[PDB]
Amino acid sequence: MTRFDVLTVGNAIVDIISRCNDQFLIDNQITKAAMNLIDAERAELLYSRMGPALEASGGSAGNTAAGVANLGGKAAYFGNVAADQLGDIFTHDIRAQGVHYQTKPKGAFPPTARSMIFVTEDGERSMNTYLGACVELGPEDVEADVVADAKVTYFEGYLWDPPRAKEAILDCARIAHQHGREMSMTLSDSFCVDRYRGEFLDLMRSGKVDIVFANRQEALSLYQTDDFEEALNRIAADCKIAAVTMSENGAVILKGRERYYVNAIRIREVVDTTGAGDLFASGFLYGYTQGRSLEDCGKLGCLAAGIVIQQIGPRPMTSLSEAAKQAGLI
Amino acid sequence: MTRFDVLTVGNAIVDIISRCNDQFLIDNQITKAAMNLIDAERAELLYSRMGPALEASGGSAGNTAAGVANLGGKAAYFGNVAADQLGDIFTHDIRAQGVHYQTKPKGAFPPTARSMIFVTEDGERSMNTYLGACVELGPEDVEADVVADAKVTYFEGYLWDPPRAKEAILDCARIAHQHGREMSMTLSDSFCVDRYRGEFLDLMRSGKVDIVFANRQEALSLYQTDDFEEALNRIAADCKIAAVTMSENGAVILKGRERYYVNAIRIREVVDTTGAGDLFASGFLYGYTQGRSLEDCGKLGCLAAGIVIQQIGPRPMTSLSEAAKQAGLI
Numbered sequence: 001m002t003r004f005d006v007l008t009v010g011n012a013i014v015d016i017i018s019r020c021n022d023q024f025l026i027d028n029q030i031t032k033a034a035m036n037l038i039d040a041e042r043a044e045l046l047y048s049r050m051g052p053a054l055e056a057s058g059g060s061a062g063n064t065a066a067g068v069a070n071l072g073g074k075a076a077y078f079g080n081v082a083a084d085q086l087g088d089i090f091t092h093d094i095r096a097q098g099v100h101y102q103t104k105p106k107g108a109f110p111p112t113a114r115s116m117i118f119v120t121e122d123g124e125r126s127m128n129t130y131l132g133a134c135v136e137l138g139p140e141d142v143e144a145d146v147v148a149d150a151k152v153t154y155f156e157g158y159l160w161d162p163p164r165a166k167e168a169i170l171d172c173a174r175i176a177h178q179h180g181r182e183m184s185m186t187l188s189d190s191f192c193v194d195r196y197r198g199e200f201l202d203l204m205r206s207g208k209v210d211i212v213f214a215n216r217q218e219a220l221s222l223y224q225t226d227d228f229e230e231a232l233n234r235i236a237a238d239c240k241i242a243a244v245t246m247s248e249n250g251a252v253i254l255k256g257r258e259r260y261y262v263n264a265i266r267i268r269e270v271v272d273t274t275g276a277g278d279l280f281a282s283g284f285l286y287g288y289t290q291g292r293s294l295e296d297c298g299k300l301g302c303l304a305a306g307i308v309i310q311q312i313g314p315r316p317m318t319s320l321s322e323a324a325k326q327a328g329l330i
Numbered sequence: 331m332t333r334f335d336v337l338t339v340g341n342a343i344v345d346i347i348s349r350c351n352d353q354f355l356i357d358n359q360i361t362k363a364a365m366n367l368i369d370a371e372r373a374e375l376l377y378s379r380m381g382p383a384l385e386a387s388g389g390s391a392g393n394t395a396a397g398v399a400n401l402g403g404k405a406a407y408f409g410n411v412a413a414d415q416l417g418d419i420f421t422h423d424i425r426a427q428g429v430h431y432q433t434k435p436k437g438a439f440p441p442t443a444r445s446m447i448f449v450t451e452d453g454e455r456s457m458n459t460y461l462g463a464c465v466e467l468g469p470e471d472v473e474a475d476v477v478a479d480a481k482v483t484y485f486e487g488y489l490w491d492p493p494r495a496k497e498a499i500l501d502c503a504r505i506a507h508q509h510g511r512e513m514s515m516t517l518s519d520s521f522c523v524d525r526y527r528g529e530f531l532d533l534m535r536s537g538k539v540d541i542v543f544a545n546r547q548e549a550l551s552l553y554q555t556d557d558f559e560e561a562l563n564r565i566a567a568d569c570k571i572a573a574v575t576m577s578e579n580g581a582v583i584l585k586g587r588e589r590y591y592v593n594a595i596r597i598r599e600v601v602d603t604t605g606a607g608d609l610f611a612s613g614f615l616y617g618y619t620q621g622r623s624l625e626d627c628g629k630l631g632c633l634a635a636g637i638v639i640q641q642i643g644p645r646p647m648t649s650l651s652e653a654a655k656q657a658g659l660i
């Protein structure tokens with residue numbers, strides 16, 4: 001037996017969520033649908049203009065770990081918060097979901113990362129992230145026994161922004177592979193891909209990453225193309241398994257020459273897209289580590305993603321395991 | 331012209347909200363549907379057992395002020411937070427709603443008040459409140475110019491728990507009445523009524539309070555009776571105006587021998603009753619300060635209350651003014 005199905009690694013963030021009109025994004029030069037990095041001064045400025053908000057634990061990989069636990073899988077998470085109230089919230093929420101979380105805060109400054117997420121009327125989310133304590137994550141935060149004992153270790157492309165997180169990831173890759181485990185990454189965001197295009201390709205081609213998650217926008221960015229079919233062929237050539245999401249058009253799972261298309265759930269109304277990709281990865285990786293077919297992994301991913309976009313906030317407040325049972329995915 | 335329609339005064343609290351099953355309340359000796367005061371040790375214990383949560387600025391009077399501002403009235407708030415992250419969240423949310431809020435924190439300790447609110451499947455809410463920095467609210471926090479320039483000053487019965495807040499309220503009553511303004515209170519909670527029964531009756535009978543808000547449970551507690559008609563007759567004898575809510579049975583507004591019955595609005599589902607009474611007071615006091623009939627104040631209250639119970643969290647995330655316009659209450 002193994003201790004963990006999925007270890008995830010990412011920027012530990014608390015989300016600050018509000019609604020806005022379309023003009024707000026233009027007025028404040030916020031790139032729509034993207035992760036916009038911001039400094040402390042810009043954080044203060046944007047917050048001063050933001051309406052009344054709700055807070056909820058976030059972080060892309062944090063959400064993915066929570067989702068795996070919610071489905072009934074065994075999950076762990078590495079990510080660095082500060083010894084402050086936001087860090088206490090983050091710690092509580094992830095542990096309360098039944099995710100192993102033991103990364104120790106290093107101090108009160110920089111403070112715990114937060115992301116001001118503006119949700120427009122169409123349900124799109126535009127994130128504005130002050131990394132704070134995330135900049136401190138490094139090799140010292142790798143719990144080697146956890147990596148050794150996890151079927152899959154999954155990490156964010158977003159980790160390439162803070163300075164030393166990549167060193168922790170390279171350590172994880174070494175340990176995972178020495179123990180016959182698999183490594184997975186998400187491309188995270190199309191501008192993130194643009195920042196780290198060559199590095200991401202190298203991760204895949206060198207075999208440090210076995211399973212890659214992308215959406216359409218990320219895949220097009222990765223190969224600098226408007227040809228989605230080219231992007232699919234290239235990504236299949238670059239990694240052992242690729243899971244590519246296409247929003248309302250569902251998803252496609254690629255392995256060598258194999259392609260498995262999955263339909264998206266028909267949605268009544270798109271409330272807030274925050275967490276869609278994260279929860280697709282939850283469903284996929286839960287299925288993968290239970291030995292399910294690639295198609296069924298895709299189905300579980302679409303189920304989880306469809307649920308999270310029908311609520312405000314990034315982590316499903318309902319039972320994913322119950323939903324999967326009703327769906328005959330069990 | 332006056333600067334403010336409604337000044338509210340209360341315990342400044344950030345809510346930590348989670349769903350639980352019925353047995354959780356019993357196992358943890360949480361009194362269902364009530365405000366349960368807790369110390370620091372008990373807060374740590376309950377939080378350790380609480381599921382993943384979301385945070386939202388709360389405080390009964392805070393919610394009421396926010397609701398008045400939402401409807402288009404001019405609101406102000408007195409309430410004390412700490413110089414910490416939770417206090418910064420509280421400060422942001424109330425000011426971002428357009429409420430005047432200038433109560434200065436006295437340091438970082440005691441920390442900002444928080445309430446762990448457990449919502450059961452029936453939508454009832456059971457609150458567990460650590461008062462923290464609320465214990466420091468005192469006469470020093472009365473902005474006399476704001477009280478002088480507000481049509482109505484409204485305060486929580488909950489203020490009788492912290493040690494010095496009542497002195498600030500007595501100062502408010504003096505200033506308000508010297509400037510020809512009106513004072514209002516909510517009975518807050520049936521156990522709060524039980525703690526301060528004599529003091530609350532005296533506030534009304536001495537004329538320090540002109541307009542009283544109660545629900546059925548609070549009115550029955552106030553007069554220690556199982557007879558609701560007796561409670562209505564007695565409350566009408568004790569205060570100039572009484573607004574008494576009755577959940578799905580709407581409300582009754584009493585003035586001398588005048589009685590005005592108002593129906594609850596049709597709702598999709600009871601998602602979370604948190605803030606129902608607070609927002610009833612918002613709608614009522616908005617109407618009242620706009621010169622509306624007592625019946626129309628009741629209707630505005632039932633509208634605001636009905637909206638808030640159909641969402642998670644204590645402050646409506648949608649426009650109350652727009653809903654009022656659509657409902658023909660305008």
Ligand SMILES: Nc1ncnc2c1ncn2[C@@H]1O[C@H](CO)[C@@H](O)[C@H]1O
Nearest residue numbers: 011013058059060115129158275314
């Ligand atoms: N730079 C970042 N790194 C990792 N996660 C992020 C970043 N910015 C925003 N997020 C998270 O992305 C999630 C949605 O995918 C949100 O819950 C938010 O916390």
Ligand SMILES: Nc1ncnc2c1ncn2[C@@H]1O[C@H](CO)[C@@H](O)[C@H]1O
Nearest residue numbers: 341343388389390445459488605644
């Ligand atoms: N002791 C208290 N005093 C004032 N407000 C409170 C108290 N406990 C809980 N609340 C608030 O009551 C609101 C619901 O009426 C919640 O938003 C919560 O913050």
Ligand SMILES: O=C(O)c1cnc2ccccc2c1
Nearest residue numbers: 190191194220221223224225
């Ligand atoms: O080079 C491109 O074609 C390309 C495609 N998509 C992008 C998205 C974000 C940033 C750069 C991109 C660049």
Ligand SMILES: O=C(O)c1cnc2ccccc2c1
Nearest residue numbers: 520521524550551553554555
């Ligand atoms: O004295 C009573 O009749 C009475 C009624 N309701 C209550 C609710 C809470 C606490 C005491 C109460 C006391």
Ligand SMILES: [K+]
Nearest residue numbers: 272308311313
């Ligand atoms: K969401």
Ligand SMILES: [K+]
Nearest residue numbers: 602638641643
């Ligand atoms: K509510």
